[model samples]
Target: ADWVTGKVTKVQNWTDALFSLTVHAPVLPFTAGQFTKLGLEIDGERVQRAYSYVNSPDNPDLEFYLVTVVYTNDAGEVVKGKLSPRLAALKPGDEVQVVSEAAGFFVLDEVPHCETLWMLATGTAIGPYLSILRLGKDLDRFKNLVLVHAARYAADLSYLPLMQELEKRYEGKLRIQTVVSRETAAGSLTGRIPALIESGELESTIGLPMNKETSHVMLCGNPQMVRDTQQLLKETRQMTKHLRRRPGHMTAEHY
Candidate 1:
């Protein structure tokens, strides 16, 4: 299927690093964690990039949360990138192109029959996980939902409100923890996720250990974080990738 056209309804700034946009489009079908390719014209050439859809499938309008990276020359002056510049130019009533199909195997069905779901993410990679968390029924199958998001500073925690809401609404079923590496927060965990997991702080904080019997893990983010985290799960927790025929205790998505 080809791409569909839509209009930008609004751009919301969640933090200095994170922003989200609402686009007016026809009702589109997509799995909770699947991503869509957004096409835009830059310097008379078409540029398209796959971005995980942050809005739940049940929502009528399409929305995405993005982390803006400012391009800078050696002189330290900030320059605009092809995608971000074009996306920044958009406003209410502005037309944009949205690809019809969503691709990726990040959906909940892949983790079939897991009692506990551990969604580990860093930076912009948290987008897809946010989508799955927002879609209430998509997580109904899992008995426990534990989200661990790691970032450099406290300000980078993009979906704090949504996470808080889910924790409040879901009560005993959902738990969210933030890890800040560079800066420390009063009550937040301070260290890299892998380090915390290695030191047993992660498991201790959650009051549950990772195991094939109790946990299914999903990882998303920087290459290093994904690789290290995968190793920790495989080597320490004895979890492997899940497949259609052979189910494992882990699933991962890279941004």
Candidate 2:
């Protein structure tokens, strides 16, 4: 085995397009936000994708939050993205290839401190943040930890219950905001993420102000949102991207 083989323990299919996979891998060591490469031998081809593990290190089986993008063309034919559809085909007892070396720099450890931590994600990008918070690391270091997730529909907010539970557990320390761009729901906002942040709506909702010294922001998911948020933080707040040479206040990962 070029890569280690693991058994698919269970797949929680939330909908046609959303699911969470729990694979049984013995002693799979990884950081909270780091990702592992999973593969399948399909139709004489080896297909693989690096997905951030959704569960904390303390969890027994590795969990992955997955979104299979199914869209209709102008001709009105439903077409799905490549790798995820193959992944969705996996069943319990199915074998999967996983690289043992988990990797990513998006982790919170060894980073500068701030009073407030902002984590904004879209779609499946929420996986990493969930892992990070599940570890409950850096919670005591920051006074406020806000997690914002934006999706196209109300039902797409798949982890709302878990997030709410985390909020309750963390009490005054953690916050979660859900934004739906195309639908309405109770206790949710309606707007694009960048526009919300630009107009002060996000900060207003969080009941806190974000400055260079007081806040450290992390962006993930949609590329446009990540780009725009970085620009806003850079120009307006004089925040610099985190780098080994010159440490700054912002970090980003486009999913």
Candidate 3:
């Protein structure tokens, strides 16, 4: 793939494992909720990965949130990511490669009309939703727009301030929910999203009923969360997957 050089303009560290990168690039115009590939040359090989947009399309500098992932392999050895660790080490003025065009069909145009829209994500998956809301497109189409960002720890809720700002900007038109799965925090739901949905706590806390007729749910982040939540919605709410040729109540992007 052809790539353009992008200079890192800024980097915001949210936690030891999480950060946001602001890069200046001449990428082609893209809709909200789309993604572009970022690459770095490591050990003589160009390594790249797709990252969702965290800034609006109108923004001159592109932004993306990332997590420096480290996990234990099956053999009890620690394994680090190929691209994320390198990305996390990036500093201002560093140059990285960016795809010339964005890609993804997770934009609002794919969602059907509904009274409420649920934007649910975990980890860096919340980036696309931020872009969508910042773009301020078709927001009037829905009476309620609920944004849910779930993480394993409170520290991982890196964009809390931004979410709060959005709530203030929307003046109650946008509802924000924070879910922490592994820990508890003030004003945050404790436990997994699917569990909360199954127990009716999520809807009750949000003070809105999510049904097939009134809601369009968008799920991202952890593939397991996406799958489990989508399955729960289908089994309990009888919601169908959204498609261009056959629009439905739920849309998802994972991995």
Candidate 4:
């Protein structure tokens, strides 16, 4: 029902696999953790995908961190992605159609009171958490905030510097950690982000425990991980999906 066209102002690369795209979308109404649909004209029709805003509502420019996959022909020659490659191929001054109404339940507005908040994300899904933390109006509501980012490589954790800056700015109130599955690094764990939590290493690393009572886990990105993590929390940890009628301790969104 709501749609508008926006011009691309900048495209900053985070790594070969990820990049941050900024668009001039003054008319789009949005909130932290909410997503807007971005579309490009394909064969005279619009092809769109939902991307989360890294920038907060107060920020005018919409920033979307994109994750791209490398494609190769039968002989290892590089190819392009279905959508990401085309989007990444875009340069400044380009334009895309954006849905004017931004919607999502992942926002922090309805979260129940808790001692701490846990934001678990993989790959580009980290966008929403960054949005919330950077603009969390009631951040003082919780004494501790933990952001866990799990990626396949060191470079995949591209937002480390920005998250570190937030950590420094918030001091004791914020803690950020990274998980790399394919490589080993000092001070970083090696495994899937969810498994780390299941085995209790994630809690030990942050010196805080996660349960229905004192924590809320908001998950995004990879659907399988989201399903697995959700099931784990429900079966053994006494947590359930956070819904208006059935409020518990977990929330999720998938691309």
Candidate number with greatest lDDT: 3
Worst 10 residues of 1 by lDDT: 80-89
Q: How accurate locally, in lDDT, is each candidate?
A: 0.82, 0.86, 0.93, 0.85
> Per-residue CA lDDT of candidate 4, range 1-255, in tens?
477988899999877768999999655567788888888877778788888889988888888999776668898899765667778878899987888888788888766778888989988999999999888677777878999888888878878999999999897789889999999987689999768988999999899999877898888888998999999999989898987798888888876
**Candidate 3 local Cα displacement, residue 216, angstroms:** 0.4
Model 1: per-residue Cα lDDT over 96-167, one tens digit each? 888887889988877767788999999878888888888876677888899888988888887877888888
- Give me the overall lDDT of model 1: 0.82
Query: Which residue segments of model 4 deviate by more than 4 Å?
Result: 69-81
**Separate clash counts for every candidate:** 0, 0, 0, 0
Ranked candidates (lDDT, high to low)? 3, 2, 4, 1
Predicted candidate 3, C-alpha RMSD: 1.1
Q: Which candidate is the best by TM-score?
A: 3
194-225 per-residue lDDT for model 3 (tens digits) = 99888999999999998998999999988899
Ranking under TM-score, best-scoring first? 3, 4, 2, 1
lDDT of 4: 0.85
Tell me the alpha-carbon RMSD of every candidate: 2.5, 2.3, 1.1, 2.6
TM-score of 4: 0.93
Better of 2 and 3 by TM-score: 3
Report the poorest 10 consecutive residues by lDDT, candidate 3. 240-249
